[PDB]
Write a protein that binds this ligand. Structure first.
Ligand SMILES: NC(=O)C1=CN([C@@H]2O[C@H](COP(=O)(O)OP(=O)(O)OC[C@H]3O[C@@H](n4cnc5c(N)ncnc54)[C@H](OP(=O)(O)O)[C@@H]3O)[C@@H](O)[C@H]2O)C=CC1
Ligand SMILES: NC(=O)C1=CN([C@@H]2O[C@H](COP(=O)(O)OP(=O)(O)OC[C@H]3O[C@@H](n4cnc5c(N)ncnc54)[C@H](OP(=O)(O)O)[C@@H]3O)[C@@H](O)[C@H]2O)C=CC1
Ligand SMILES: NC(=O)C1=CN([C@@H]2O[C@H](COP(=O)(O)OP(=O)(O)OC[C@H]3O[C@@H](n4cnc5c(N)ncnc54)[C@H](OP(=O)(O)O)[C@@H]3O)[C@@H](O)[C@H]2O)C=CC1
Ligand SMILES: NC(=O)C1=CN([C@@H]2O[C@H](COP(=O)(O)OP(=O)(O)OC[C@H]3O[C@@H](n4cnc5c(N)ncnc54)[C@H](OP(=O)(O)O)[C@@H]3O)[C@@H](O)[C@H]2O)C=CC1
Lengths: 251, 251, 251, 251
């Protein structure tokens, strides 16, 4: 009778997390916008565990509020909320980015994460011991780099929102954790280049990035943590990723 | 000449910054939503320096773009942009905040700050050498505390967005700085308590907070920095403000 | 075979980690200054797994270099180095601290930590895939608080020292992790009060702090991580610990 | 009068800071190990302001204590303490650095800085309003990069040690500030490369780094700050210096 609420379960980390929690007997609540991928994932996982799918755009707060209020009884009691739904766009410098791409990232990684958190806060508090809010931040939320502009800032929002939630949830038993992954081969770079599969292959070629299951098993590790423990933040990078020297402009 | 673009100049830091730059001969272009106090500030400063006022709400991207397009010739060439427009709401714990208060802060401190930057990015690059983007962050953008929930997260967005802007504007000479002040006695706390001056008066009592003009003299220092220097972030607190021990839940 | 090098294994995290790694078949190399506790620990764990004890003061670099050079063949191949040996002193304000207490923390938490890394760096690089350097930092290495002065600064050193090591160890496969725990009931506060067990009971009374086995299981989780992954930093606090409001000096 | 205690005044920031403080009538106390540079600065500056020189190695606490106790009456009342004495060594990767170079960095930037503060803390507290402890950090104290190993970690120590000092000195009016500069042509790389002038010219070539007087003029700005304000940290970079993308090991 353990239920996990996974946003953005149609691909990447969310899709892998649905399978990792299913192998552990957890009931699943999978959301996203590609409904025909949720139906495909439901039919593959309804055998193992009970599955509840939702066609949900996290940028619409009224839809998320309705989706949480309309949860059936076999799902309403959420133990773990995984705020995974997110995206990056326009990897070019900030002076060459369209403002609608900046708005799409803010609406999903900031407002979308705050929309889902607000809707599930009473549910997670009414659970209590063992409850976890797993916010998926990024290494970009701490380390600046060219082409990150609003994506990294949105993930720094996610980091501080996680710490601030802990200050206000003291005594409720609810845990808030920022899982901040490094470079990982999912649909992330494909969405970030608006469909340039060659770019998403030249980036990961010749290196060992994180797999989608690497982050999913980290989500499960955080969710099954003992009730008295709380991870403030985990920054997970592939060991083949680090930091370069400072950029110095030269004549 | 030298022109400053000040958002949210109707009160607090913004109105005090208008007087600090006027005393140095800088031309002013001040924005905000309460036009009737902007007109009062214009007539007080039109003697010292030429002033152009704009009724602008930073949450409207189309209005911000039009406001920049309608800039007079003696004003369009902005040297320093001060992204001062911001607000906090609901000092209660996060589990007791209405979602409209969270949306208002994201729409103003996050979306509003990127709206002004996007519209003026071509303008600031065509200036160069001495151009500066002064983003008004906060200690809340780095340090968590109870009741900050989305405010601190929004100011952490501003911190990382400033660093990321520096990565993309390398070689243009344009400077980006996060001015992160501590507690200061302005109209700020009145907005955060929805009009309770008594709550805004129990604060600042018996202590020496920062003044509104004090941050202005610090904003002017950043704008007048030599062209080859760039301050990534300066966190200025009143010397009577610091950090408490960790919160420990007991029985 | 897999061998772990644990500094400060006589109590707390190191002693608990020795039992957790013994339960997984890992060969142990336990160091410390209390030799009569290392001898008792060898008999408790030599049954399950081969154990090698070393009387070592990490502040003596020549003693550390000789101790690693004198490793037997069934131990020389170190997979995981856990730099756990550390201590805090003088919880009073900095202006009332004796400098020898400041020096002991620097000699142990800073110099002692780089001494062990310097002595074992060639061994870990000659290991390669799966090797880990687990530096035991603290929440004090990121968040300032009263009574933390050189202790928190020493743990901020280890945080950045871990990040900097990763930049230089790219391509060697060895992983560096800052495990930064929160408040935990060990001999830690006993050493910080120079033996006041009453003070170490008034601190932990009425709350649920971290156990030594909680952090010990975190070391094992990090050490057994898949070879391609690397945890930059994990800050684990007891869920009953968070951040207080800002300190404001008042009349 | 007003007296400044400057460590590491034989070159770079310390030597340049001596002239800027002399231009304001402040009495000077300059330390360092190269006496023939201290005597030359005294003969050049004894005209403007009274100067007291000390051949002091900050690594010997007893000498630091003796130098502070033996201050003449026209010097003992120090207003601003600038912990500037510091150094980096071995720019090669950490696995190819001799431990004696690591100890020199820890002894000077960590142990040496706490030695000077411990000896001068009672005097600065007995000064009261306007006293400042200006710790010279670095961008290396926050941002990791290859070749920084112990230098960046030591500057992370000073960053957190600055924050922690404010928690213990709350209400005394004495200010603690982390001045974290970027790349600067300050004879730093010459000492840092063990005398390689060719390497110290290719680093600053074709770019505009910070000057010793640029940072010196920043030290004076912090020292002349109003007594009620405190700069927690100011990170000053050349606008032609920023952050590069993440390092990815390939092939
Ligand atoms: N991959 C990486 O390198 C890193 C990724 N991350 C974070 O990991 C998380 C997962 O991204 P990843 O899985 O890697 O990339 P994917 O594109 O593979 O996953 C994207 C997920 O986000 C969902 N999503 C996007 N926008 C919305 C929306 N408005 N409403 C609902 N669901 C939405 C998608 O579902 P649909 O499109 O069907 O709505 C999809 O399930 C993201 O938050 C990303 O920032 C963090 C660090 C590094
Ligand atoms: N007060 C403090 O102690 C601290 C303040 N700050 C920052 O200082 C900045 C200024 O606030 P402060 O100076 O404190 O005093 P105020 O909070 O009184 O200034 C608030 C400003 O926000 C402007 N504003 C709000 N919504 C909009 C909008 N949609 N479009 C344009 N302007 C808008 C207001 O202009 P109008 O109301 O006329 O629209 C007003 O001038 C804020 O960003 C705050 O985060 C940072 C750290 C600490
Ligand atoms: N416990 C807590 O609340 C927290 C602890 N930490 C870190 O945990 C680590 C220690 O675990 P702790 O919890 O302190 O458990 P203890 O302090 O009870 O055990 C600490 C160990 O450090 C060893 N040690 C200390 N100084 C030296 C030295 N100079 N040379 C060799 N060995 C030494 C001791 O062995 P001997 O005495 O036999 O030499 C002892 O076994 C420290 O690094 C501490 O900073 C981090 C965050 C919170
Ligand atoms: N240069 C840069 O680009 C950056 C510098 N910094 C910091 O700023 C400070 C100045 O660097 P820089 O401007 O290069 O000046 P230098 O590094 O050229 O020399 C600085 C001073 O350190 C003193 N010093 C070194 N070791 C000791 C010691 N053991 N005891 C006493 N004094 C000592 C030297 O005097 P002696 O002749 O007695 O050795 C010298 O006067 C340093 O602390 C450095 O860490 C920070 C960021 C970047």
């Amino acid at each position: 009778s353990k239920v996990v609420f996974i946003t953005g379960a149609t691909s990447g980390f969310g899709e892998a997390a649905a399978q990792v929690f299913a192998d552990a007997g957890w009931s699943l609540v999978l959301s996203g916008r590609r409904f025909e991928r949720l139906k495909t994932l439901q039919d593959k996982l309804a055998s193992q565990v009970p599955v509840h799918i939702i066609e949900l755009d996290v940028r619409d707060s009224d839809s998320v509020a309705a989706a949480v209020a309309a949860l059936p009884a076999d799902f309403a009691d959420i133990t773990t909320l995984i705020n995974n739904a997110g995206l990056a766009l326009s990897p070019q410098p900030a002076q060459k980015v369209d403002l609608d791409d900046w708005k799409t990232m803010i609406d999903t990684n900031v407002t979308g994460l705050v929309n889902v958190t607000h809707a599930l806060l009473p549910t997670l508090i009414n659970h209590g011991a063992g409850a976890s809010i797993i916010n998926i931040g990024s290494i970009a939320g701490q380390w600046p780099y060219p082409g990150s502009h609003v994506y990294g800032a949105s993930k720094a929002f996610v980091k501080q929102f996680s710490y601030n939630l802990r200050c206000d949830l003291l005594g409720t038993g609810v845990r808030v954790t920022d899982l901040a992954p490094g470079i990982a081969e999912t649909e992330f770079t494909l969405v970030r280049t608006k469909g340039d599969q060659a770019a998403s292959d030249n980036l990961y070629r010749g290196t060992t990035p994180l797999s989608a299951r690497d982050i999913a098993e980290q989500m499960f590790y955080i969710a099954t943590l003992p009730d008295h423990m709380n991870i403030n933040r985990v920054e997970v990078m592939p060991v083949r990723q680090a930091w370069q020297p400072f950029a110095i402009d030269r004549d």
